[PDB]
């Protein structure tokens, strides 16, 4: 519900499904916490990563495992993942989707906020 | 259902909502004919533009009015739409979902095809 | 070289090569007159299109033809084409870049308008 | 100049200009090691990162700092920085082009790989 993940792929046209998904938390010391993770669905979507109690403000890393995706499938792509890092809830809760559009070469990444 | 139209706003990081979409289908004598139109909802979607019945095999014209909504807005903006054309359903019926990213003077654009 | 049209490639990592693109202005009874056109070079690139004198104020399409360049690399593509339609406006700075990038189910475009 | 960083604005359709960049090789022990860095020019692009001899084989990061970007044009952004990882390989055509296209709450980026 508050940090959901969508991957799509511009090759197949379809949703990325089992991409990997690591989330991260900046701690006070300036390391990268592990914080969440899991793998898209059928649909592309992870949902279940975090409970608004736990999603407090901070600054937070999605990092997609774009390369795994394309050498799952076997082929070689350029990236060795994608990151996605900003700053969360630092005005109150809001609920975030992390947008994902994958190529061998290239990607396209969004976000939607919303406040419930 | 067989045809959906998504759409985003990567200034705002909110779905783009209101937008005015036509849909188009290439006739026998080469013209664009009038097959569907609507707006996006406040979720930035657009459902209910046609049927599995009506939605035969053709070159199908998603012009989305872009430049409408960075007006509506108050905004000066590149595109005068953002069309996607493609041809649907030559290998039976499928699902489309149409979905554009819009920015001032830049979009990307792309679709999601499942067969059910 | 008021109008330039660039292409790319994100399944490959390369400029998009010998891709056609057909520009056409928008006439007074709002058909589409062709304009200028021709193929990208080795660098993805298009030059040459039209002059300053003939570039005025209007609606220009560029029409980049996307599914002949997948159809040649043997990939299925799910575009006719690309459309690019804007106004060029003479209150804006000289120089128009189109810019393409293009995957089988997918392509983003961008405008750099420059003095 | 094996490796160029272009950054364009989707805004403004314009350059994205003094943005600053780092690059960034990773090392034996997992860190991230610093390797060049500069601001883009009126143009967009930074130039002369490294040279062939430099650059070897490895992974590479290159961190666009956005932020600072969006919020100098008065503009809320979204993320902290756009972050670009990748591996430089011999076994490839020897020159990169890291692209990035920025919006407030998006970016897109390719790499264009060339001989
Ligand atoms: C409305 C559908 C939903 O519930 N969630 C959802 C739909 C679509 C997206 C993102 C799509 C997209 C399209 C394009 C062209 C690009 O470039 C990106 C990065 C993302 C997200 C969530
Ligand atoms: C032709 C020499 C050169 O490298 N010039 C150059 C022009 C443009 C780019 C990248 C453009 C671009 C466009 C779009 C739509 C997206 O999404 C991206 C990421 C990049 C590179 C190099």
Chains 1, 2 share one sequence.
Do not use: Q
């Amino acid at each position: 519900c508050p940090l959901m993940v969508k991957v799509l792929d511009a090759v197949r046209g379809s949703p990325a499904i089992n991409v990997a998904v690591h989330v991260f938390r900046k701690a006070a010391d300036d390391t990268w916490e592990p914080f969440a993770s899991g793998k898209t669905s059928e649909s592309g979507e992870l949902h279940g990563l975090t409970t608004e109690e736990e999603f407090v403000e901070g600054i937070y890393k999605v990092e997609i495992d774009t390369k795994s995706y394309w050498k799952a499938l076997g082929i070689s792509p350029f990236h060795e993942h994608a990151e996605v890092v900003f700053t969360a809830n630092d005005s109150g809760p809001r609920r975030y989707t992390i947008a994902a559009l994958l190529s061998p070469y290239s990607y396209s990444t969004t976000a939607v906020v919303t406040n419930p």
